[PDB]
């Protein structure tokens, strides 16, 4: 047959790439020599193309102007800080260790210094739970108990733009416009509506997959489609 769409994806052509040349900035945490002593002022609020969420532009003391992964509540004029001695207030960034247990955090690093990896989407947030001299347990937006190095930096608060999902797109056109800002090929043709040559579920006089949809995880790309390594399906039971 012919390669399925998920395989055309990998080659990374224009159709499947994200409009990077139109993206603003990775919002990785700023690096601090040490002893904290790093504060800045929120000069403006902007719209992050890549995330459909607002982001804040900060001017730090040493004259460095950078966009920051803004939590909900940051406003122009406000003063943010990044370092160990940072004051425990919304918008501030400090090691999971200096953060009191029970505080909502966002843009959590996976490895100290990586600049944040977890909880950066609209309205989401990780809940810090346990502390220690060896590990800091964080509860990620998926509800997973994550064990992190207490030296991993994070921001206090939840990410801006909460409830973005509450409103429906209503029309294809709206969907269209957002898709046009991500690395995603849209719209989607159901494989079962394709010719047998184009996809595992293609062909047949009437549309219906010609096999069970739950594919093994060791299935080769091109064959791995439908419900991947499903532990179960349906809602019943």
């Amino acid at each position: 047959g012919r390669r399925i769409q998920g395989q055309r994806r990998g080659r990374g052509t224009s159709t499947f790439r994200a409009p990077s040349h139109r993206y603003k900035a990775d919002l990785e945490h700023r690096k601090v020599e040490d002893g904290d002593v790093i504060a800045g002022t929120v000069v403006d609020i902007e719209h992050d193309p890549a995330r459909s969420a607002p982001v804040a532009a900060v001017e730090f003391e040493d004259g460095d102007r950078r966009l920051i992964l803004a939590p909900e509540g940051v406003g122009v004029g406000d003063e943010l800080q990044v370092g160990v001695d940072a004051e425990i207030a919304p918008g501030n960034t400090l090691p999971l260790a200096e953060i009191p247990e029970g505080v909502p955090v966002c843009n959590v690093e996976s490895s100290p210094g990586d600049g944040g990896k977890f909880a950066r989407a609209s309205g989401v947030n990780a809940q810090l739970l346990t502390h220690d001299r060896n590990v800091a347990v964080v509860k990620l937006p998926s509800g997973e108990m994550k064990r992190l190095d207490p030296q991993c930096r994070a921001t206090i608060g939840v990410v801006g733009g909460g409830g973005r999902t509450d409103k429906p797109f209503v029309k294809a056109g709206n969907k269209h416009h957002k898709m046009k800002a991500r690395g995603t090929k849209w719209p989607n043709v159901r494989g079962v509506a394709m010719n047998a040559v184009d996809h595992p579920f293609g062909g047949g006089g009437r549309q219906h997959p010609g096999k069970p949809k739950s594919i093994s995880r060791n299935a080769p790309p091109g064959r791995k489609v439908g419900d991947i390594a499903s532990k179960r399906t349906g809602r019943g039971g």
Binding site: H47, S52, P54, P71, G75, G77, S122, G123, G161, G162
Partner: protein
């Protein structure tokens, strides 16, 4: 509100856009001053007509349910 949609889209969808859009456009109290003169300026961006203050907040409303938890915690 949703009237701009005519008879297209259906009940549920037209209703939620109305709810969302009404709260969305209510007079919101500015956190800096106390005057309810906040109008949305874009997705997640809010600004006060009075004090000029510009804030980050929910997408369709200046304060999300969990955005308020943070104050307490």
């Amino acid at each position: 509100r949703t009237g701009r949609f005519g008879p297209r889209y259906g009940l549920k969808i037209r209703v939620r856009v109305a709810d969302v859009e009404i709260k969305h456009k209510k007079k919101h109290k500015c956190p800096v001053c106390g005057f309810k003169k906040l109008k949305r300026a874009g997705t997640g961006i809010w600004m006060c007509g009075h004090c000029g203050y510009k804030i980050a907040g929910g997408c369709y409303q200046p304060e999300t349910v969990a955005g308020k938890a943070v104050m307490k915690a």
